[model samples]
Target: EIRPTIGQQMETGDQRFGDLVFRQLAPNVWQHTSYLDMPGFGAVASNGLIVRDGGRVLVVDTAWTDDQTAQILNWIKQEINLPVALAVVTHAHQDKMGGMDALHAAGIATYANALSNQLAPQEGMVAAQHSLTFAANGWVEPATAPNFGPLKVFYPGPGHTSDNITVGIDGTDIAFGGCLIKDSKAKSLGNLGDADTEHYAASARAFGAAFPKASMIVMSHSAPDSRAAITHTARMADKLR
Candidate 1:
C-alpha cells in the first residue's frame, strides 16, 4: 500500500518538475512556469525578464538552481549583444531571486528594497510557506555595481510582501509588475497569507495611478501587452475589496 507523504515528510525535490522549463512571454520578458513536469512542492519556475534601453540590458528576477540560471543567461547572450547592467528581484522569493548570484558574477549591479535584500536571505522561506509561494534560499552575496548611471527604484507599498517593488524601465514607459499585478485570468490576488490585504490593494491602486501613462505593463510571469492585464488586475482588486 502506498501512502502520500504528509507534513515535512514530503520530499522537497519530489516537488521539482524536471522536464518543464521557461519560455519567452514578450520581446524581452520570459517566464519559467514549470520544471521537468514535477511542479515539485508548488515550485513554479519564477519569471525572469530582460529590458534593453540605452544600449544596456537590465534583468528582472532569476530562476532556481545555477544550471537553470546559466541557461537563461546563455540564451540572453546569444540573442543580444548587451550584458546585464542591473538586476531586480521582484520579491524575495527564491524562485524570483535564486539566480541573483549567477547574474552578479557576470558583473551586474543588483538592487532590491532595503528590507527585501536583508530579509530575503534569512526569512524568505518562511515568507513563502506562510504566504504559499516559493522563495529562493540563496542570494547574490557581496552585491556589486560598476559605476553605472544612477539606479532608479520605487517601493510602491506592502502588498505581495513588505519589500515588493515595481521596477520601472528608464527612458521608457514600462513597469515590471513583478508579482504585484497578477495576470488577467488570475482569480484571486494570489497567496496573501503573508501580506496585508488592504495594503496590497492600496499598492496596486497606487501603482496604477502612479504610472497612469505607462504604455505597457511587464508582468513578471505573463505575456506582455494587452490592456486587460492592467484593467483586470485592478478589477480583481476592486472585487476583492
Candidate 2:
C-alpha cells in the first residue's frame, strides 16, 4: 500500500518541540529525546530513533509518553517530510511502548518480539500490533514495511529486559540499541529489576557483535555514541553476571 505524502521539503539538521528533541545523527537517521520524571530519578531522558528510506519512515521505540510521541509523528511528517509507515517497540517498558497510543492513534502499524507483546499489557503498556518470534541471534527485515530498506531487526538474547531488541539501519550505518546498550559514561547497567543479569553479559556481547559496521548507536536514557557504548554495556553487564 502506498503511504501518503504528509508534508513539505526534506529539510536537514536538528528540530525540536517542547521537551522532545530530534537530533539528526546520520543522513537518514534521527535520534529523538524525551523525558519522564520518575519519583526518585528526577527527569530521566529517553531516546528513540526515526529512519527514513524513500518517502516513508520507520520508528524504533517511542518517547516517554504518547504526547511526546505524537510530536515525533508530526515531526516526521512535517520536518522530515515523510509519512511514518511503521514502528518497532524494542521492549515492553514504559519508555519503549509508552507512546504506543499515539502510534496506534495515527493508524501506524507496530512490531515487537512476541515476548515483548505478551508482557506489554501485563506491565501496563499497549501491545505492539504484530508479534514476531526469532532465532537465537538472528535478524529480520520488517516485512510489513518493505520501504524500510536495509533497516533490520535483531533479537540478541536478553539484557536490560527479557524482550529487548536492537535495530540496524545498515544503509545509514546506524544502530538503535534502545535500553539494552548503555552510553559510554554509564557507570552501571541503570536498571536490573527486570533484567536477566546472568544472561545480560552474553546478550550485550552478542549485540555488540551484531552491528560492527554501524558507527553510531542510539540508546535509551543517554547520548548516542559509537560502538564503544556497546562495549561499555558488555563490560557493565559482565560485572553483574
Candidate 3:
C-alpha cells in the first residue's frame, strides 16, 4: 500500500515528454505536472492530481500520450507504490483524454463527460472507454455537486469546451480547472478552437462562485496558482466577449 506523508512533496526527474513533478498541496492531495506537444501551440505543460485515499489511488487526468501515460503509471507503482484505481478525463481535448486508451489497456477504468465522449470522435480524437454520463447528469440537473470517491467534479457551464469540468479535491480545496482556467502568465484564453467565447466569462464566474475556497487552482497547461488563473481567464473572456 502506498502511504505518502500527508504534506510531503516529491517528484520524478525529467523524461522525454517532460518531468513528472508532484507536490503535496494538502493532506493526501498531490499536484502532478507533465508536458505534451500541441500541434500549433508548441510544447505545452499539463497538470493533474493524484489523491491517496487509504490504499486506493485516484488519478484526475492522464498524460498526453500512451508512452507518457505508461511513465506515470510506472512512477505510481515503482515510486508511490500505489495501485491506481481510476482516472478521470476533464474534457475531450487531446491533452486531457490522450491517455484514455493507454489507461484502459492497463486495466484502469477511465471516465469522461458524455458531451466529451460525443465530441471527441467528431474532433478526430479517440473517446474514453467509459462515460461519466451519470456524474454529468448530477452536475447539470439541478446543478448538484458530483463526485468520484473523495473528489468532487463541477461543471461551470461551457467555456473552453462544452464538456469542460473542474475537479475539486474535497479536503484540499484544490480545484483542477483543466484548460478552462488559464495560468497567471497567460495573455489570452490560450486555445479557443472549441471554446464558447460568449459564455466563457459567465462559466468562469460560476466556477469561482462554486469554489471560493480553492487556494490552489491547477490548469491543464500551466503552473498551479491561487485564484489568479481563474481571474486571468475571466479577464480574457471579458476582452474576447
Candidate 4:
C-alpha cells in the first residue's frame, strides 16, 4: 500500500468507466489511474500524467484501451475544460499507448519516440500519429530536453522497455517517470518481459541524475513520491541484475 504525502492537496474525480480515476496532483497536473484486468496477474493499475498549460493540454500516457482513453478525454473536457492538444506515449507498452486510436479519432495530436513508433505496431498496438525522432531542438537519439511550453520530455536510456521515456512538468520540477522508474513499494522490477535488465540500473541512475531536484516523481504503476522511487527502483534493478 502507498501512503499519502503530508499536506498534499489533491482533488480526485472519476470517469464513466468504473476503473478510471483522475487525481489532481499539483497545479495543472493530474494523475490518471486506470485499473486493468490482466490474465494471470488479476487486477493491475496503470498510471498516466496530464499537464495543462493555459488552454493547451498534454497527456503523458493513456489508459488500457481506446474506450478507457475516451472516458479520460471526456472527463478532461468536462472537468478541466481544456482542449487536449497533444499526447506523448512514453513507450510501446499497451498501458502507455492504448489510447492512440481514440486520440487520433478525436483529432488530438499524438507523439512517441521513434523506437516506440516502430515497435508498438509490431506489438499489435496502435502507434502514435506523430513520430518524435529527436527532441525538438536536440540531435540525440534520446533528446536532452524537449519542451512543449511548460512540459518537457526526456529519454534517460531504457529500463522497462527500449523506448521508455520520462516526462517532466517544468517550473514545478515534477517528473512522470513512465514505466522506466518503479514504484517505491515494488520489491522486484515489474514486467521484465521486454526489459533490458543488464542496463536497467544504469538507465534508472541516469534518470535520477537528470532530475535530482524533482520534488514529485510519478511512476507508471504506483503512487507518486518525492525522490525515493528512483532510489528504490535503482536498488531493485541492481538486485534483479
Best TM-score among the predictions, by candidate number: 2
1 or 3: which has the higher lDDT? 3
lDDT per residue (tens digit) for residues 144-181 in model 4: 22446676667777688888887777788788888888
Q: What overall lDDT, based on C-alpha atoms, would model 4 receive against the true structure?
A: 0.77
Query: How well does model 3 score by local distance difference test?
Result: 0.73
Q: Candidate 1: global Cα-lDDT?
A: 0.56
Higher-ranked by lDDT: 2 or 3: 2
lDDT of 1 by residue, 99-199 (tens): 66676677766666556666776854212111112124211222332333422345667777777776555455566677777767766766666676666
Pitting candidate 3 against candidate 4, the one with the higher TM-score is: 4
Per-residue alpha-carbon lDDT of candidate 2 for residues 66-179, written as tens digits (9 for 90 to 100): 998998888887778877889988999998899999999998988888899999989889999888677654565355434556677888897888898888887777888888
Candidate achieving higher lDDT, 3 or 4: 4
- State which candidate, 2 or 4, has the greater lDDT: 2
Which stretches of candidate 4 lie above 4 Å from their native place?
A: 1-18, 134-147
TM-score of 3: 0.83
Candidate 4, TM-score vs. the true structure?
0.87
> What TM-score, over all chains together, does every model reach?
0.69, 0.89, 0.83, 0.87
Better of 2 and 3 by TM-score: 2
Q: Taking the tens digit of each residue's C-alpha lDDT, what string does model 3 give over 133-204?
A: 534333533222233567777788899998898777777768888889887667677789889989999888
